Design a protein around this ligand. Structure first.
Ligand SMILES: Nc1ncnc2c1ncn2[C@@H]1O[C@H](COP(=O)(O)OP(=O)(O)NP(=O)(O)O)[C@@H](O)[C@H]1O
Ligand SMILES: [Mg+2]
Lengths: 176, 102, 393, 113, 113, 112
């Protein structure tokens, strides 16, 4: 489906420039998409082993405690520095009878936080991949085709007009 | 400096109380999401949540994936997992790559 | 070339029954109305017109094969004497007049063939009859004009057509309509005109189509993309329109004593939302959609496959009565509503789909259900209401 | 479609003593917000809402409300100019005061809720 | 490419007495499978292997054999209508019988390998 | 704009004995480096500051200096061929020797 533009010589030149730009932008968006993807694969593997390990350990801690009062009535917050991976905004997270069960929880915190951080980073990484995919796709399947189809249409129209003019000029001449 | 929130069954998650973590005990779909959306309002950094509790609220949870904070992290209960955390990693990788690549 | 005089025109406000679900439902033509079907080659203009000639509830049909294929006129002369109305045992041929001037026939006589047909239709209309004239195709008529225009050495109009093309077209469409005939009875009659337009490349910005759309109230816009996917009639439900829709809606509500116009509106709303959503599914995939959005696609798919698509060559799919169309649309729309409610209570899309395999299959077969047993379409409603309600547990 | 539409005789026919003293300011403001909001709304249809800025998200919601509420009144709806100017403000109030560059401070203080 | 391709008059030249009784049903079915197969390939390219149901993969494989084994015959190979129809049945065997919805049981019983 | 401009008989008028021996080689190099610079500029916009190689940032700066200092001489500035050649070298000197692939090392060592 072609765009709503007027078949003028200037419009043709505009769309042709707009198309060379579009093409180049599409390749560069594909290049990024692929980079983020291989950077994503490294981090998602980290996430996976990390999540498997901290699922097995948090599970044991929890089971111990349960198998063991408001003795739990008596502070730790976290710090978030920010860094960049390729172009994506990513979080940096730092801490800021029954005694055996209580301790196991203390030893989870560091691994739980790293996971929080790695899981978020992956999440943010994944979203930005989708964001790039949508742009690549909107270019490959809508913008570039429309440009291409409109350009071919206008060439044809400009051509019909030129033919129409010579037809009328020949008739004009022959009023004589 | 951001706060930590924990959502889960009394039995499994109460010890987090010792670290000053805002531990909360919702048990229905209404309670969990109501308790999350405030935690996001008070700029929490991470919210840990049980898989059993998480399974009730996929709609509220996926609404924050794109946000830098809060990080919403799925943990087991004392009973274990439903496979969601690992499947969410599974989904996200196949989505990005055309996997499974793991 | 001269219109038969009348006392006056009247508003064409009674719908014609084509038996074509997409036509009668979303884009109706009234008796004494004018509809165009512009479309690319192989899209289905000739078939739509044949269907109408075959099924519509008019008294008489005038079929002008203008500049088209010989075989098609042949097809009518053979098929029509064998197509028997069971209530009365008369064949379609007993109510048909055929005018044929094929593409390799004298070109000028394309113009002749149009006027012959319209004049004959006026004549029966004058007696008090409801007549439908189908022009296949008005583009060949316009080409005849251009060729004569060239010999006459006239100054070209748009795309080489003569300057009087727009008014010639407008003159012919105005010879159609609902009228009170001359005479003391003041009897009423009508001509309904259905014209094919055959635009180059399927480009509807062409002068014949554009001039036609200026005077007709119904646009059946055929899509080559739909035709390639085998979705017939290949009527593009987003671009098409009937300007008789509002009035026909009022008329249908009253004759049916049902909120038909609302159902139609809800159906169009659904189809419109699917076009917004498919724009995203092409970009990112179905996975991105919310459960609400997921369902809209499935209901829309139902309207498209179970309702919009009609096989003209199937013995039962070929005509669908007014009552049947109301029943089929109710069922489809009902399933939508019930699920929408199931989603809002707390159930999820995937459990609703799986729990309703059987009733959805039943819905997709309604189009084949015999006219003598519409009750089998009707019972689907309670099946929908109950099976979804179980799932809600 | 208000963007390509025009009236060449609107100045001397509107304002204090004709319509109200805020006619032209709000009119200009609405066009600015609509043209921009319409561009933002269309991007969002293509690249997703996420591909939009925080404020362009607002401008897009504005263009929805503008079309659906303001321009869409129905063929049997007769709005007094006072109803029309008042509705215009209710839309403009969707936006932050800083965005409303086409309106002078004197006028904002007086009319903007 | 059988998708943009069409013969309008085809049923006047097929069926019992002309080709074989299975002709029209196999045609409707191979076509539908190939269309669904091709749509699955189109999905794998755009979004990767993972976006496909196991059934999509079957259909995708169907499309590929259809192209490579049915359509591709070489420019010097003559196929009698019998050899063609029989080959149609073989590619159909790739699919679950439950999938072959355009063909009735009586034909499936006589021909389905 | 150098990119779409062309002289069809430049070779017959350049090099040893007519201008200087380094004329052609530098022209070819400046032409490429400017093309590469403009591409690097685009990349900057599309993928952002970070995706740029340090070698890429230089090409960006080169294309900027090339338009602003070399091409932009002013309508009243008469440059001898020798000044032009020297300024080109000066501009090419922003790049690593590793990048000036279209010049013989013979010439790299003579003119920097
Ligand atoms: N309503 C329908 N139901 C089923 N099949 C259809 C329908 N309409 C068209 N077809 C199929 O598609 C073909 C095209 O129909 P046809 O009437 O030749 O369209 P057309 O637009 O008039 N072609 P042309 O006259 O060349 O512009 C027919 O041969 C049928 O195979
Ligand atoms: Mg035809």
């Amino acid at each position: 489906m072609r765009l709503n533009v007027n078949p003028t010589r200037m419009e043709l030149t505009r769309l042709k420039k707009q198309l060379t730009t579009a093409t180049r932008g599409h390749k560069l968006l594909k290049d990024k998409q692929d980079e983020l993807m291989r950077q994503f694969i490294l981090l998602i593997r980290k996430n996976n082993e990390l999540r498997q390990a901290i699922e097995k350990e948090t599970q044991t801690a929890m089971k111990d405690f349960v198998l063991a009062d408001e003795l739990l009535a008596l502070n730790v917050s976290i710090s978030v520095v920010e860094k960049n991976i390729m172009s994506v905004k990513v979080p940096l997270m730092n801490f800021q009878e029954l005694d055996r069960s209580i301790d196991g929880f203390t030893q989870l915190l560091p691994k739980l936080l790293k996971l929080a951080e790695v899981e978020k980073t992956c999440q943010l990484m994944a979203e930005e991949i989708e964001k790039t995919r949508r742009r690549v796709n909107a270019l490959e399947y809508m913008t570039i085709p429309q440009l291409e189809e409109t350009i071919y249409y206008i060439k044809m129209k400009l051509e019909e007009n030129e033919r129409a003019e010579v037809t009328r000029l020949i008739k004009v001449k022959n009023m004589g | 400096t951001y706060k930590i929130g924990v959502v889960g069954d009394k039995d499994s998650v109460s010890p987090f109380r010792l670290f000053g973590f805002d531990v909360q005990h919702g048990t229905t779909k209404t309670e969990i999401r109501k308790t999350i959306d405030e935690m996001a309002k008070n700029e929490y950094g991470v919210i840990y949540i049980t898989e059993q509790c998480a399974n009730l609220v996929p709609e509220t949870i996926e609404r924050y994936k794109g946000q830098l904070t809060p990080a919403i992290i799925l943990i087991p209960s004392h009973q274990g997992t439903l496979g969601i955390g690992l499947e969410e990693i599974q989904n996200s990788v196949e989505k990005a790559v055309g996997q499974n690549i793991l | 070339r001269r219109g038969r005089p009348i006392k006056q025109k009247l508003n064409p406000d009674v719908p014609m029954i084509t038996g074509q679900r997409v036509i009668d439902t979303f884009f109706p033509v009234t008796k004494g109305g004018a509809a165009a079907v512009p479309g690319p080659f192989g899209a289905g203009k000739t078939v739509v017109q044949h269907q109408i000639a075959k099924w519509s509830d008019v008294d008489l049909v005038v079929y002008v094969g203008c500049g088209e294929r010989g075989n098609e006129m042949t097809d009518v002369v053979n098929e029509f004497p064998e197509l028997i109305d069971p209530n009365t045992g008369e064949s379609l041929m007993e109510r048909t007049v055929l005018i044929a001037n094929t593409s390799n026939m004298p070109v000028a006589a394309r113009e002749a063939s149009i006027y012959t047909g319209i004049t004959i239709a006026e004549y029966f209309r004058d007696m008090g009859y409801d007549v439908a004239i189908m022009a296949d195709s008005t583009s060949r008529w316009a080409e005849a004009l251009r060729e004569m225009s060239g010999r006459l050495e006239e100054m070209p109009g748009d795309e080489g057509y003569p300057a009087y093309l727009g008014s010639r077209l407008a003159e012919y469409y105005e010879r159609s309509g609902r009228v009170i005939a001359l005479g003391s009875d003041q009897r009423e009659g009508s001509i309904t005109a259905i014209s094919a337009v055959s635009p180059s490349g399927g480009d509807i910005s062409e002068p014949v189509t554009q001039n036609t759309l200026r005077v007709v109230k119904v646009f059946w816009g055929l899509d080559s993309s739909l035709a390639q996917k085998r979705h017939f009639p290949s009527i593009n439900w987003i671009q098409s329109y009937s300007l008789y829709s509002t009035e026909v809606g009022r008329y249908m509500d009253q004759i049916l004593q049902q909120d038909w116009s609302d159902m139609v509106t809800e159906g169009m709303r659904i189809l419109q939302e699917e076009e917004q959503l498919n724009e995203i599914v092409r970009l990112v995939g179905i996975d991105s959609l919310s459960d609400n959005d997921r369902l809209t696609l499935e209901v829309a798919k139902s309207i498209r496959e179970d309702y919009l698509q009609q096989n003209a060559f199937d013995d039962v799919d070929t005509f669908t009565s007014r009552e049947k169309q109301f029943n089929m649309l109710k069922v489809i729309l009902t399933f939508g509503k019930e699920a929408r409610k199931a989603l809002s209570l707390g159930a999820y899309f995937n459990e609703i789909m799986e729990g309703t395999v059987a009733v959805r299959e039943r819905i997709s077969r309604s189009k084949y259900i015999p006219e003598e047993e519409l009750a089998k379409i009707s019972s689907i409603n309670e099946e929908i209401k109950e099976t979804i309600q179980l799932i809600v547990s | 479609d208000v963007l390509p539409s025009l009236s060449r005789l609107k100045d001397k026919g509107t304002g204090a003593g004709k319509t109200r003293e805020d006619h032209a300011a709000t009119m200009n403001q609405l066009f600015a917000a609509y043209a921009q909001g319409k561009q933002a709304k269309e991007l969002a249809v293509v690249l997703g809402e996420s591909a939009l800025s925080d404020i362009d998200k607002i401008y897009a919601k504005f263009a929805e409300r503008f079309e659906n509420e303001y321009v869409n009144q129905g063929f049997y709806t007769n709005r007094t100019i006072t109803e029309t100017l008042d509705l215009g403000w209710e839309l403009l109030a969707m936006l932050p005061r800083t965005e409303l560059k086409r309106i002078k401070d004197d006028l904002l203080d007086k009319y903007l809720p």
